[PDB]
Amino acid sequence: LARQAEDIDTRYHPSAALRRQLNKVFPTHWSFLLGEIALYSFVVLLITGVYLTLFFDPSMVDVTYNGVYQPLRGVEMSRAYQSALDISFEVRGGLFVRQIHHWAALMFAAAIMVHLARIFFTGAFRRPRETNWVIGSLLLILAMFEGYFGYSLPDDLLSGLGLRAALSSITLGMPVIGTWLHWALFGGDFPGTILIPRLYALHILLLPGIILALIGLHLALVWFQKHTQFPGPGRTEHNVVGVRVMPVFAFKSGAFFAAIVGVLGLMGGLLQINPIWNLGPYKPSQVSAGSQPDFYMMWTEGLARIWPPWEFYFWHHTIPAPVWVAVIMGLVFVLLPAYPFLEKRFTGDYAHHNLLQRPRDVPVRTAIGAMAIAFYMVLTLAAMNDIIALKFHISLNATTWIGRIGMVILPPFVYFITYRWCIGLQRSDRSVLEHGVETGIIKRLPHGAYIELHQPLGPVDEHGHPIPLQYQGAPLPKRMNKLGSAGSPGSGSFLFADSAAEDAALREAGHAAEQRALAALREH
Amino acid sequence: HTGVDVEDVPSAEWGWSHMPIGVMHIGGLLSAAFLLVMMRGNHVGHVEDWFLIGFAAVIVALVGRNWWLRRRGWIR
Amino acid sequence: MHIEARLFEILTAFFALAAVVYAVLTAMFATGGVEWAGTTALVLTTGLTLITGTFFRFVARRLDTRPEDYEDAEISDGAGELGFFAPHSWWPILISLSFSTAAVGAALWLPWLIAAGVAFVITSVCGLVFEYYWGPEKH
Amino acid sequence: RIKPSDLGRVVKRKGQESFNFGEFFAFTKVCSHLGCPSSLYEQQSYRILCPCHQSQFDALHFAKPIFGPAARALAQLPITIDTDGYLVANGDFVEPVGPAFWERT
Amino acid sequence: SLNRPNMVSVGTIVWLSSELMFFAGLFAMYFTARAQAGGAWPPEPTELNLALAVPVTLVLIASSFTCQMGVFAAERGDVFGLRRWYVITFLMGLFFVLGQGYEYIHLVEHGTTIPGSAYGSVFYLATGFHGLHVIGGLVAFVLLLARTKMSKFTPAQATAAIVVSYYWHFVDIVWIALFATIYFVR
Amino acid sequence: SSGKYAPDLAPANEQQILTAMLTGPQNMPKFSNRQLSFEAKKDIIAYVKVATEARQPGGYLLGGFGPAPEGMAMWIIGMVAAIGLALWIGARS
Ligand SMILES: CC(C)=CCC/C(C)=C/CC/C(C)=C\CC/C(C)=C/CC/C(C)=C/CC/C(C)=C/CC/C(C)=C/CC/C(C)=C/CC/C(C)=C/CC1=C(C)C(=O)c2ccccc2C1=O
Ligand SMILES: CC(C)=CCC/C(C)=C\CC/C(C)=C/CC/C(C)=C/CC/C(C)=C/CC/C(C)=C\CC/C(C)=C\CC/C(C)=C\CC/C(C)=C\CC1=C(C)C(=O)c2ccccc2C1=O
Ligand code: HEM
Ligand code: FES
């Protein structure tokens, strides 16, 4: 309406910051949506957690069930386990909501890891954006621990076993502080009466607030330090080529948000995750062959499984073996946010960067990243020792030793192969730059020679052979059909053709449009 | 960059393309040492010790071959 | 295409004669009558050679001599443009890996792994087939 | 309860020779690595296995660890019978139970 | 140069011969264990429903003619008649598959299973592989239709249409043989 | 450990479960009738027969194990669909 907008102007008068934000340009590359995936997962997590807080009681006081789930009637449980059973079986929609919540947590973790991979392999962490790299690393650690505290609130057998082992028994063994930290955290010995309410507070208020603040600072830095882009035709270290916010970018972002919510709803309805009733309440005397925390904590479990038992005994003291696991965990947590500074010190490159690198052009860093992913994958597979040995008929001792030896011999092999593979991709690019695109067509040349009929991308000499071009950090076409070569079928719908006049008109319009687009981007 | 040739790595002026060779040599030696130490406090059984010594010897042989050939001029 | 069809027809003649002779000589003189396994195998071996030789005859009877079918032919006769021959492609190894996943899932009875392998096979075969027909991204 | 057929393959740790009442031994159930219940008892192998990180203990060799990330043996309890014929404990553990820490076992 | 005999055609024909040998193996399996079952060799809890097996056979025979109409349309280079006839053939093949599956359900409900007897074993192993071949043919139809949608129509596209056509014809002839052997001869 | 495994309990009937826990087959401890009464055994039999044949109220059982199949399903379904949607919506070069 005109009156409302006129009054908003006469009262707050933005009208220039509004225009400035409406004309902000964003690049359109498929890999720049991986952070949006994590953002939308976090929004869904917020909504579903706010729902879940209206039904949960985080107490450890014991009760008898006497509920609807008959196979558990008469069993002594805690109040948290009974609250989770009530959410699952007596609130209309509660099982659906908590399954959506757990699936959203898993998608959150996976999206964060894929986004970290993109940033690392493209080099978007260099000089201007090192602080944003550090902020993202802190966000990753916080998300790990938030999910860990999350799936431990329904105090059932498997989560209680994971709690006991990891938290209690690794904190208790630390060299000097150790038991002091354990007792400050648990209020005493392991099964107390304050752990579940303390974790509930930490999980619904503290860590979510810190994560929200850090996400705000992260997105503000991304908004005000403009986005990076890949090298291309009209792209420069001084501009941003893409689309403006107002009509297109907001539309695409909202559509992607809706699609991600749809996927999460589908898989929270159709797939069962964490059926706590098949378990029981946690009890210190019972155990099962079940193990393996959520997949983002599996590498610590696998490290604890495959580390050798090296202990130290000196004067009335003891250093157990899980201290090694704690040390390696802290060493990873330290080395992750320090990589930009370590790399700039090693390479001696202190310049400003706005253009991205292709992973094939940085072979050493690509091989480092592949080695790290191989190490992570070995540790993650070592966590499912028993499941692997049961389903794929292998011995348990064999799986343990296989993990123990792979952890040391596989990453350098992956490094070597990744290095050679990147150099091979570079040589393929150079061949395509020197000759033309290979078309696949063979001739016979009446004196009996076979030729291949290349297709040049630039000017040719007087002898017909194309003139070689220079590499410019952009991808090169390898298939003839990806260039407009044999396309544009009939212009019907699927079963009945249109008229030939309409077909010809649409063809000419599209050709003119694409030609003017490429001209407008190449000439300026 | 510290330096490789564009005849070895075409895109040598677009990104990090060289890691010193002493790093890889001592890394192989340290991996062999770790594999050897990994049989301290041998729990019952010796079939895995054969795999350990096999892989350690293979790594040492690879490192020694590379070092020898680089020293005598058949590499670089 | 005369010699190829003639080869397959010679094979067909021998296989048919052997099939009928074995079938009769087992109908009589054998322990439990017809053998029912080698008979079927020989019959459909004859069928194989018959199908191939028939196709070759039918394409040959409606064809004119090619330069490779013709002695006294010159190399200048075959000058021209041959078909399309695929350069580099990475889809075969993905198809092989998908089939191997399905085969391991069939060896160790794991229906979820069989289903995953079949989905991977479909996807990689589609990738192979559409490789030289995808158009430019329409933006 | 061990079969009377073997009862000669036991190794009987240095200070715990009289801790068993014939064929009854009664070790602890808390694992010495990270405190999980060591429940998987293989009776014809005479082996104890924990399903958390897959340590193995030899029930015939004072529950000494033979595989996995564990490094110390399981604590053994002294047992006997009373004048009424019920199984009772003949004292306390001679060492702390469970995971280790800076002070001792 | 142009070596007039088509190459994809030859390759497809020879692979179809190989598949014939595969079905030879299956037929030998079936014909053995029938000479062993004495008297009423199809056991008593087994009764074949001829009120369901003849309609689906007719539907497959009609699929053959619709596919031949599709390749006729293909040889004169218009894509839309091809698409129409091939969609019709896909629908008829889906009908055949659903009829076979329903007959399987009804046959397992009160009788034959794979671990039940030898007749059930040979029957299911002989007909289910043919069903899998039909499903493969359907997937091929879908892929070819998508490829005709995604670019300009050429003689290579026409060749793809023709080779899919006689793969379908091979499948139909194999079904004719299996049906005549199992339901009528017995 | 070292080969041996414990089987699935689905294809066993009630008498088979009873005799199994009465006799204690290889590597399985033998549960005497004096340490585990007949009524307790019958309760255990009822519990296992319910736990093996009841329908899951939350969707497709992903194998009955914990979050290893769940992480596998995550990476193979949810992330693949999300990345395919990103490839469709965004551009590439
Ligand atoms: C790239 C990055 C790791 C470089 C870091 C640089 C380095 C210097 C930092 C120091 C860190 C230290 C020194 C070593 C790191 C190793 C480890 C201990 C790190 C802990 C956490 C770490 C940061 C997580 C990184 C892992 C990585 C970045 C994930 C990206 C994976 C890729 C790129 C996704 C592509 C799409 C995908 C392949 C689709 C197909 C699905 C496949 C099978 C996914 C594989 C897969 C995965 C990834 C699972 O996590 C998983 C978990 C549970 C069950 C199964 C799976 C599973 O199959
Ligand atoms: C680091 C980590 C990841 C490593 C691993 C650690 C571990 C393993 C993981 C975590 C595990 C656990 C143990 C961690 C525990 C963390 C714990 C729960 C942290 C919780 C956070 C903390 C304790 C909360 C307390 C701190 C907090 C509450 C204080 C901040 C105060 C707040 C945020 C400010 C609110 C007020 C705000 C809205 C207004 C700002 C003031 C404005 C800008 C100026 C005021 C102002 C204005 C604006 C005028 O316009 C004006 C006009 C005319 C006259 C006057 C004024 C005027 O005064
Ligand atoms: C931000 C990252 C978050 C992660 C990674 C996460 C993760 C999890 C997970 C995996 C569970 C176990 C689900 C299950 O029962 O199977 C859980 C439980 C729970 N979450 Fe979250 N969550 C997050 C945020 C939140 C927020 C913001 C709230 C509240 C505002 C919340 C409230 C709850 C509650 C009350 C439970 C216990 C209810 C139940 O287990 O059924 N969560 N969380
Ligand atoms: S807790 Fe028993 S092995 Fe780690």
Swiss-Prot record, chain A:
Its EC number is 7.1.1.8. The chain crosses the membrane at residues 32-52, 105-125, 133-153, 176-196, 204-224, 253-273, 322-342, 368-388, 405-425. Inhibited by the anti-tuberculous drug Q203, an optimized imidazopyridine amide (IPA) compound. Q203 triggers a rapid ATP depletion in M.tuberculosis grown under an aerobic or anaerobic atmosphere. Also inhibited by LPZS (lansoprazole sulfide), a metabolite of LPZ (lansoprazole) generated by intracellular sulfoxide reduction into the host cytoplasm; LPZS is a potent anti-mycobacterial agent that inhibits growth of intracellular M.tuberculosis with good activity against drug-resistant isolates. Heme 1 binds at residues 101, 203. Keywords: Cell membrane, Electron transport, Heme, Iron, Membrane, Metal-binding, Respiratory chain, Translocase, Transmembrane, Transmembrane helix, Transport. It is an enzyme of class 7 (translocase). GO terms for molecular function: metal ion binding; ubiquinol-cytochrome-c reductase activity. Heme 2 binds at residues 115, 218. It is found in: Cell membrane. GO terms for biological process: respiratory electron transport chain. It comes from the Bacteria. Its main location: membrane. The cytochrome bc1 complex is composed of a cytochrome b (QcrB), the Rieske iron-sulfur protein (QcrA) and a diheme cytochrome c (QcrC) subunit. Was identified as a high-confidence drug target. Belongs to the cytochrome b family. This is Cytochrome bc1 complex cytochrome b subunit.
Swiss-Prot record, chain D:
Disulfide bonds join 36-52. Residues 1-88 form the Rieske domain. It is found in: Cell membrane. [2Fe-2S] cluster binds at residues 31, 33, 50, 53. Iron-sulfur subunit of the cytochrome bc1 complex, an essential component of the respiratory electron transport chain required for ATP synthesis. The bc1 complex catalyzes the oxidation of menaquinol and the reduction of cytochrome c in the respiratory chain. The bc1 complex operates through a Q-cycle mechanism that couples electron transfer to generation of the proton gradient that drives ATP synthesis. Belongs to the Rieske iron-sulfur protein family. Was identified as a high-confidence drug target. The cytochrome bc1 complex is composed of a cytochrome b (QcrB), the Rieske iron-sulfur protein (QcrA) and a diheme cytochrome c (QcrC) subunit. This is Cytochrome bc1 complex Rieske iron-sulfur subunit. The gene is qcrA. The chain holds residues 323 to 427 of 429 of the full protein.
From Swiss-Prot, chain F:
The keyword Transmembrane applies. The cytochrome bc1 complex is composed of a cytochrome b (QcrB), the Rieske iron-sulfur protein (QcrA) and a diheme cytochrome c (QcrC) subunit. Keywords: Cell membrane, Electron transport, Heme, Iron, Membrane, Metal-binding, Repeat, Respiratory chain, Translocase, Transmembrane, Transmembrane helix, Transport. This is Cytochrome bc1 complex cytochrome c subunit. The chain holds residues 188 to 280 of 280 of the full protein. It comes from Mycobacterium tuberculosis (strain ATCC 25618 / H37Rv). Binds 2 heme c groups covalently per subunit. The keyword ATP-binding does not apply. The gene is qcrC. One of its GO terms (molecular function) is iron ion binding. The chain crosses the membrane at residues 71-91. Its main location: membrane. Cytochrome b subunit of the cytochrome bc1 complex, an essential component of the respiratory electron transport chain required for ATP synthesis. The bc1 complex catalyzes the oxidation of ubiquinol and the reduction of cytochrome c in the respiratory chain. The bc1 complex operates through a Q-cycle mechanism that couples electron transfer to generation of the proton gradient that drives ATP synthesis. It is found in: Cell membrane. Residues 1-52 form the Cytochrome c domain. Was identified as a high-confidence drug target. One of its GO terms (cellular component) is plasma membrane.
